Design a binder for this molecule. Structure first.
Ligand SMILES: Nc1ncnc2c1ncn2[C@@H]1O[C@H](COP(=O)(O)OP(=O)(O)O)[C@@H](O)[C@H]1O
Ligand SMILES: Nc1ncnc2c1ncn2[C@@H]1O[C@H](COP(=O)(O)OP(=O)(O)O)[C@@H](O)[C@H]1O
Ligand code: BEF
Ligand code: BEF
Ligand SMILES: [Mg+2]
Ligand SMILES: [Mg+2]
Lengths: 406, 417
RNA sequence: UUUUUUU
């Protein structure tokens, strides 16, 4: 008997058990309470958020990890006993309430025994590194969607702990690029913990993502205030850090981080100093720490963040935000509006796209092939570049056979 | 028996060492407690204890010996230095101190300093009589700090082009100016390697402010020197205090006639941190910089100088431009009017994967005749006249191909004839 | 007011 499981099952399945014992939120509360009279075990789970007083609540993914009526109370002694912090996934027995359910004991901390999670190294003390193991994006299945992933592997490689972004103007193909990322992440690397954080973007894109991606989708559409965007993103990035502390390879696909930085700018207190474009002089610190959370860890695991970014918006702010994040991350995949307006996809700007320390992600042969191909494409215009590379790649199914044509 | 030596050793060797002394079970308690209990037991035997750290004098007249593992911030193992000890040897903030220590007594929370054995790697008496950094007579850089390895390395190309475009002397006040992803950090790393090989006599420090954390570990495992860092995970308040400790430590070593070099990355972000903590003056410059915000970072950069009495302080720091934020153009141009050397890197050259992506015409060093021989300057002068009409990319492709033909710039000069 | 608007 689990709480969040009762919330998932339809109300019809609920009334069946409730009548046998004797709103949907109340009938669940009545089933759990009457069951507590029997003396049998009752359960609940969630992602922890530690308040200022020292206690915490297990937030629900249904509420985008915000406050909810079905949230479980976590006492400070429980947090101290297992050294819990915000972002930890906690499961265990609870008790009927006083207007809040309360956790009796925790069985699993981050899908693992609670005792093992106590002597772990904190995320801040993990030794950072440049990305070693690479996340190759190519499916090699011969599909038209694979072309996007194949050009990405040549232009800007992605590794574990990468801190990259997809820069483009509106309607250039950022989101669809990111959807193409998710498909290759789940098909090529099922081992990775895939999360998709959608901030201040379209409402049809989260439902499309929820059914397209194999993973978790946390969203906060543009129907939501900027303060909600910040709180939702903080919960997600803290949950990612906790899994990295358990040596997990977490990947966050953010869309968009430029709008996430805007939300911070609208929230930060006015400092009396404003950068070019209307960005407060202290507004970009927290977005830098968010994006900058992605890193490769020597002790094990990694956190990878690939986020979409806006440029050529006519607003100087987004140019400042892009350049700031560029100086924070180590990978950029640019997309040109001129290429996208000619219906040439992917609309990748090859000469601007690139990845730092790409030798740590590529074989020596692969590095030379991409180096030569880099020099050949550079003199061409951006449209002529893609149309040239699309045809050469279309001739073959995989990049390896393309390397052999050279 | 030293505190920081015990902090460096792994916990496994500490527990075994503590059990040999015969102590209550050390496996449960934290590593900090193992060291503390091990230090106390050694004090019970009557044997001496030792500690060390860089001094930071508080407002009340006493100070503490901060440790490098805390980025010279407040630490649990800080050693109290009494005011009488400071007056005896005229100690000031930044002085590296080593001496005998004792565990804290009842009602105390810190290790205390009994006797100071070494002040700035020297006899404590010599520190009493000294000329202060503020009174040292400044000079333009005299002694050349040549970066060229000469080993025919492909990485040496960056050092060779640097020597021709913007020479570096002892006491230089230089800038590696470029937009993001142009090659500033790796060029600073290339400089760090050249300093460790060609100038092991110099005291090398690498200060990393508000930059990537993976570059911190990359730097400390690459350079043969001390690395102090404060990544972008840290607030601006921490950046300032860490930078102030490092710059004062450099001034103290220069007072001992040492040649100190500080590779800072980035100084633009250090200037932003000062602008974050500066008191509002009611006057804001173009780009969102307070009218009084750049005085402190200007004195920091301006600390680099050549000293006639002996020693020097060199600072090679990276700066950002073309960020879309006018603030960084103000910060860069303000530092250019403070320093005397700029090595520009071009995003246009870097996008073509041409490295080092050096803007030759914009780079340069002031009073470079004081750092070059008569014929070396005449050869660099002719080389600039030839390179100037070329484009940014054509200039580097031309110069790198010519330099790659030879191992050293000297042989390259002999080819020019 | 300055900064932002703003080149
Ligand atoms: N790989 C692709 N193949 C075909 N069409 C594409 C592709 N990528 C983008 N597009 C076109 O671009 C339009 C908008 O792309 P989108 O990903 O929403 O850009 P952005 O996220 O930058 O707004 C889509 O309607 C689609 O028709
Ligand atoms: N000398 C060089 N040789 C090869 N690649 C370089 C060189 N300098 C820079 N790069 C490439 O540029 C990327 C970023 O350079 P970096 O030094 O971080 O620039 P910045 O410090 O200005 O951001 C590196 O990851 C590297 O791939
Ligand atoms: F309209 Be796109 F998502 F920038
Ligand atoms: F992004 Be670079 F380090 F300026
Ligand atoms: Mg989109
Ligand atoms: Mg850098």
């Amino acid at each position: 008997m689990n709480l969040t499981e009762l919330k998932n099952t339809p109300v019809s399945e609920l009334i069946t058990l409730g009548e046998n014992m004797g709103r949907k939120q109340d009938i669940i509360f009545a089933i759990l309470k009457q069951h507590a009279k029997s003396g049998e075990d009752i359960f609940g789970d969630g992602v922890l958020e530690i308040l200022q007083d020292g206690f915490g609540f297990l937030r629900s993914a249904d509420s985008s990890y915000l406050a909810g009526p079905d949230d479980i109370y976590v006492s400070p002694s429980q947090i101290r006993r297992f050294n819990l912090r915000t972002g930890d996934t906690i499961s265990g027995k609870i008790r009927p309430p006083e207007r809040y359910f309360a956790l009796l004991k925790v069985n699993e901390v981050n899908f693992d025994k609670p005792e093992n999670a106590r002597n772990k190294i904190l995320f801040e003390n993990l030794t950072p590194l440049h990305a070693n193991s690479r996340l190759r994006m190519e499916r090699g299945n011969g599909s038209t969607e694979d072309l996007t992933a194949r050009v990405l592997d040549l232009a800007s490689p992605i590794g574990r702990g990468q801190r990259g972004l997809i820069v483009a103007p509106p309607k250039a193909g950022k989101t669809m690029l990111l959807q193409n990322i998710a498909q290759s992440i789940a098909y090529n690397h099922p081992d990775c913990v895939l999360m998709v954080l959608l901030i201040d973007e379209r409402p049809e894109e989260v439902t499309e993502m929820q059914r397209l991606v194999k993973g978790e989708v946390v969203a906060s559409t543009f129907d939501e205030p900027a303060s909600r965007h910040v709180q939702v993103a903080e919960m997600v990035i803290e949950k990612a850090k906790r899994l990295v502390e358990h040596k997990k390879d977490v990947i966050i696909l953010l869309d968009s981080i430029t709008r996430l930085a805007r939300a911070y700018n609208t929230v930060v207190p006015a400092s009396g100093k404003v950068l070019t474009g209307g960005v407060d002089a202290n507004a970009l610190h927290r977005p830098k720490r968010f994006f900058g959370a992605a890193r490769n860890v020597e002790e094990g695991g990694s956190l990878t963040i690939i986020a979409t970014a806006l440029i050529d918006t006519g607003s100087k702010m987004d140019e400042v935000i892009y350049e700031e994040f560029k100086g924070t991350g180590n990978m950029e995949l640019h997309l040109s509006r001129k290429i996208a307006e000619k219906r040439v996809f992917p609309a990748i700007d090859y000469n601007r796209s690139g990845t730092r320390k790409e030798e740590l992600l590529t074989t020596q042969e692969e590095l030379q092939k991409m180096w030569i191909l880099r020099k050949i494409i550079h003199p061409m215009g951006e449209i002529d570049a893609m149309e040239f590379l699309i045809n050469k790649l279309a001739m073959t199914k995989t990049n390896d056979d393309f390397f052999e044509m050279m």
